[PDB]
Amino acid sequence: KVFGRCELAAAMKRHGLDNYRGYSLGNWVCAAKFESNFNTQATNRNTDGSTDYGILQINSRWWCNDGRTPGSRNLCNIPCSALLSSDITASVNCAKKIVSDGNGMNAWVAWRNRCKGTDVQAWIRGCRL
């Protein structure tokens, strides 16, 4: 599913990501924009042989199981393919664990390099939320 911007904002907000661990909704929308372009089906292989999955590009070394990543911990205890669903529940549940892990949203490289410090509220402009 390719979410619209405000579509995604609404769903993230309903699933409790607005200000989760202190990160406003626009931070999460910005992260999703630059991680996946709002496409739930996005997958990208990392240099280390792991793969990132879904709307928030969650990795198969620590967080989900894809069966082809040595050392997989599956700490979100889910198949990585479940992170590709049109329903963002599993991605949000897992993202809550990731952002709680100690470095906040810096865990997302696109967020640190493209969102952090910027006017992230722009990402929720216009939305009826």
Ligand SMILES: [Cl-]
């Ligand atoms: Cl956009």
Ligand SMILES: [Cl-]
């Ligand atoms: Cl915001």
Ligand SMILES: [Cl-]
């Ligand atoms: Cl594995």
Ligand SMILES: [Cl-]
């Ligand atoms: Cl959803």
Ligand SMILES: [Cl-]
């Ligand atoms: Cl933080």
Ligand code: NA
């Ligand atoms: Na894994």
